[PDB]
Amino acid sequence: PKGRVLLVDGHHLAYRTFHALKGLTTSRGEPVQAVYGFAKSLLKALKEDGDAVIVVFDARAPTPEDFPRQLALIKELVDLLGLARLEVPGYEADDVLASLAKKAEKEGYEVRILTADKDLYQLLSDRIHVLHPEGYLITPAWLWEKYGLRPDQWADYRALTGDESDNLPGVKGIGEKTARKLLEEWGSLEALLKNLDRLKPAIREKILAHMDDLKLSWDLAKVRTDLPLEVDFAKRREPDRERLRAFLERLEFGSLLHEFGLLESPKALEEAPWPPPEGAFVGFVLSRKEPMWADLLALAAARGGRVHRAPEPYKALRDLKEARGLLAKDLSVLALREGLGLPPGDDPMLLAYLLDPSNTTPEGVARRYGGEWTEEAGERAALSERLFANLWGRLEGEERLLWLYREVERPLSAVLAHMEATGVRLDVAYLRALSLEVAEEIARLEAEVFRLAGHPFNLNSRDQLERVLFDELGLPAIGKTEKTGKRSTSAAVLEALREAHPIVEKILQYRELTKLKSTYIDPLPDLIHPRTGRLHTRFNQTATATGRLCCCDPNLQNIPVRTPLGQRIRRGFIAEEGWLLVALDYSQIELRVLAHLSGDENLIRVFQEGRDIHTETASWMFGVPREAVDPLMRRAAKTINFGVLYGMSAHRLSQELAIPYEEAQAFIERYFQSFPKVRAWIEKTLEEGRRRGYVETLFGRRRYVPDLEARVKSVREAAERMAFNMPVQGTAADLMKLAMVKLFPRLEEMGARMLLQVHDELVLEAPKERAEAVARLAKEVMEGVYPLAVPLEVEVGIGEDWLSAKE
Template identity: 45%
Template sequence: MAKLLLVDGHSNLYRAFFALKTRLSAPDGTPTGAVYGFLRMFHKMLRELAPTHVAVAFDVSRETFRTRMLESYKGTRQPMPEDLRVQVPLVQKALELLGVTLLLTPDVEADDMIASLAEKAAAEGFEVVIATVDKDLMQLVRDPHIKLWHTRLERLLDEQGVAEVFGVPPGQVVEVLALEGDASDNIPGCPGVGEKTARELIRRFGSVAALYQHLSEVTPPKAQKALAENRELVELSRTLVELKRDVALPFALEQLARRPPLPELAEFYRSLGFASLLSELGPAPSPPPVSPAELPALPWGELLPSLEKADLLACRLVDGQLAIACAQGFASASAEKALAALGPRFFAAWCYDAKALLSGLRDAGVAVERSCQDAMLAAYVLAPGETVELSALCTRYRVPAPPLATPEGELSALLALAPKLRQALEAEGVVEVYEKLELPLIPVLEDMERVGVKLDVRFLAELSTKVAALLEAREREIFAEAGGSFNINSPKQLAEVLFSWKGMPVLRRTSKTRAPSTDADVLQELALQGFRLPALILEYRELSKLKSTYLDALPKQLGPDGRIHTRFNQAVTATGRLSSSDPNLQNIPIRSELGREVRRAFVADAGKLLVVADYSQIELRVLAHLSRDPALVSAFERGEDIHAATAALVFGVASELVTPDMRRAAKTINFGLIYGMGAYALSRELGVSQREAQAFIDAYFARLPRVREYLEGVKEEARRTGKVRTLFGRVRHIAGLDSENANVRGNAERMAINAPVQGTAADLMKLAMIRTYESLKAQGFPARLLLQVHDELVLEAQAEAAQDVASLVKATMEGVASLAVPLKADVGVGPSWAEAKG
């Protein structure tokens, strides 16, 4: 039999919040104790109750139909503690990643949603279990198919169990509550009639209606008098405590079937420090057979007339063939045949992951110059940073989710999602971001991935040997400084050396074990305090990471053609920037000399040269444009060294008197502001006191007041609307700006400040990539884009054309948009990435 588990979200979250004695928090300071406790309980319920279907209900707003009936309803309830309120979205995100449907319906309470869904499911033959400690929900157990899992007692209550725990059977729960009221919800009941009397009266008379029919028989006389004087109050109370059972729910029961957790769950748990919870997830039982509406498979010739008339098309590759669907069904044909039949209409068809589709078509011998519509990218533009898995999108946009592993399942889902995504893009005002920035970039990235970049394996091997020798030397220095040998890679042993052997101050403890932390921030701070050993450990870690992540790993990731083919991820970052993986080339260190040496291994093919174009201080130029600060704009217009110019302003000296330390401080402030850096972080970066750092910041804003006005305006916009936008309209949603928790609020402010600047820079880079790609093709240059890393583009060109390509790229990047300050790109040519960059 199918079993539906319905979880009372807020009830269990409150229970978890007050039950956990130890305060837990994520690395960014966000409280996580209630999330952890809730998930521990939830995982246990999944294991022990083994439901086939699951949903969790949360209250959406304070105002409901009950508050309109009684203004004081829940009026005495204390506001949710701030430390708990910030955890609600974390719990909801975890549940979504677990593949669980959330019940979020305005104007009614979570209990009403649970009641409506429970009775509907019971009527259709489900066994229903409600997980809560809320006595209101006991009234539902009168149905023999519905039971209540009491989360405090950890006991499954049937009708007899409710009678034992509450004192009356489920059918009389409402009657008792009507008399005794409910202090937690501020339901008055009958003044003068307490818990014991209410139960005795209902056991005797059976209901409130029968009680009033026999009012003269009620004893004691005091209770009879109270009931007579408060009849309207009792009847109102009864109406308030009886749950609604007819809430319209925008999904079918089969959509609540348990699904495997999404891949992002592991990283989300790790980000909160909950990695151990992953081991507590038992396998999801297979749901009972259901019959979702699936598209019929039709012969190509039979479906073709319908495809030509259809308003909405969906497509995917199936075993090398292109499957095309409309409302009437789907059919598969060779890519060449299908594209010839569809013509330009193919570009209006919806797929999931258009880059993979275009790559598959090229593998099948059909090159497509443009992309069709992409549900994954549309969802990303709407909610950057959120999961874009197809199953999650079906849940988010409340569409039926047939088995997505089948061609007809994915095509059905796409046909259902497409109109909702299009409507959402228009409502959010991000159609141009989707159509002008993201879709045109797809063929650019597909081509870059296919071309790859050549790697000098011999050079990497030599560099690896060199770094291995440096690691041995650092190890000897570390042991000498420590006074003995130990496992440098063991946090426990390192903590013993630093804090027991050497007596260094414990700056921070881990949230889980409360052991002294030895993370990079702690080591950096200790190093700034003058301790040599932490500085050596940091050097050792950087060398070790460089060797394992790049020097030894990159040669193993070569393709058969001797080139690295990284994958560019277009729907991952919250800011709109691209990321790369397999391998990740975005994290190649650039500050150290050895890190820069890694770039020397990326080389041009025989007879070719690499062209490297790097936007100069693009984020600061974007800040100047967005803030329109006269001093900042003027410095860029004059082509000055922006950090030296800023230093002259901040320290009040002539530009020729700016010292290297002044310039370094100004540079740190310039870039730090974009990321919301405060006095504490700046003091650590510069190695000065917080008071000095704050003085630097105050002087900066005194000389550049429009920058401060802009940053404050961004935060205000985020507080007012819950989101911020880039110059091109890309949106990022920001939560936590009104939090009473300083860590949560500070983190939200930093995200709000950073998103428009970094996002606009990302948009400019994407435009530059699109236009460079198109210009190279249009003018027939023998050159191709290879990489995009940070603010750089790397191309490979025939040696004789390399300088012309460099000029074209420079002009394209600098002319991609008209800002209040000129865009500037530094371009170089050379046989390797490092040499081209100069």
């Protein structure tokens, strides 16, 4: 067989489905039952496929007023899918179909015709078959077994009957046989179609008893196999994925586009029954990325390359000991919601992320190491297996990375799944009231932007902005980043100008406050899950540059710390009815980590003594006893203690404080005079960084910094910041993650739970008559997570809302 050809009866399929799913239309009117029906059934056959696919149409007089509208969309759909369309002017779909089937058959093709209209059953033969829109595989055997006939005599058997429209009103019966129960029993000695005179009533009587009624029933044979046409059998074209999407979304059926990805699938490997062996990698497909709000569309497993596919995903989740594969965490969150305890196991992403924190997405990890992140549960599983193979083999030779995976990454996965699957209760009543409050704050600011500038224009609509600034002129350049386009303008434009004009400042206040409101106060009440009644923030274990947890929906991280609004927003997050929120926070961990990593005895000493690092630093910088340190002094000490963390720079500090460049340089000198090892540390961090090509955290977390050795000052000053900005933050991240991993086991027994983790804070939720005890357990665990040169202090709080516990 030179191939398989799937001939589609676009014409009769389009007609059939127009008189099916009669309800379907896009919510705005626009009917869609014909397009849908056609698309759905097309896919079914295309699932079983053929090398070459040709959709035949009629190439009007009394058809439905809406039919052609939909038929035109059907063809648009055929095109956009890269399938061959064929209509020969003057020929009826069926004739072309029959003829295409014959041609392809003769040319050494196995031909499968997707149609419902029974006429084509006469062409049934080996090579040529029929796929019913409904299902089955109408074959010649199917004819003998379910009808008792053979193709050669099936358009005949159909001529003494009448389907629908195949006009023949009158059969009688005879021994109850009607014409149908008989059908085959007239095939012995023709009569109607060749010789046979005297015979029984109906059987014969009715045959001749209907002249003219037969010189129309010949329409069954309206399947001439000799239509003169060329069109050759080529394999599928490329689909217009940009417009298939635009198309489907216009009919509101973009919702099920994923199905169409399942035809351009890289050759099916070998399979096996459902329950995959213990140790197989799972692949899965969800209706939406957010696991809590998603529907598990498909679940598959891979072992040794043999893909196993679940017949029903949900019941199937019960056959797994754990979720082992890409985005394993996301499946455990779904299973959790589904009341199933399926903990996250190995995941290639965790391995990739350790080997290199630039590996942040499955799409990219997959592409980078010889694979592809598809949308088929089965391919994502096999991919999940080869990636683990390829990647475990490398990480294996690295003890520091292996330790991290085994003691931090892998178990953090399981802790992440419970936090995401648990959610936080929100005070929706407060969210709405708060929104009322914040709405007006924005109003007054817009009003003031009209009160001044005169013409009450509308902010944000960037066309105006330029204009209001021509009615009161003042406009130069910005800097070097983001240049000239309408985006590079809205990016850095105006900021430079906020300085001396209230109008260009109130504009910031508005423009920004709306974002904070739209990002943190409005989406929130809507993110309250129906089944849980809680918001389920999402936690990405990989994602960041420092190794810090990334969260989204909402990004708690970017919620403004220590401001009238950020504080107001945290009040939104509340404790369950009879529970209390326990927020624990690591006081100055980056500094306690810098002291450890630098080894600076004076830094180590302050933390050991239990002293205020900003006052002490001020003492040794401005030569006055701690008791005599004044507000300004502790202010310069606090910022330098803050700036040293990422170097900052003399000018930066010179600017962060109202001080001549000169004085800021002296301040830095004094800082390193009191902290020599801190300077030495930075110096060496960049050396090993430059030599080795990467830096690390206390625990071994690597980040490649090639740009330390650049040409452009502006550029080697970037890599240099990040260069030591990672060991410090990286170490602080690692201590938190590890803390979470130790603490988790004990909150279960304490009946408490872990909710959020932002910056260097961990928010727990515990039963009222438990909160105090849980708080003390967590402080212990957190403080003694890992032995460093100085103590670790955890400021803790308890309360009904996140803002009560405060930090």
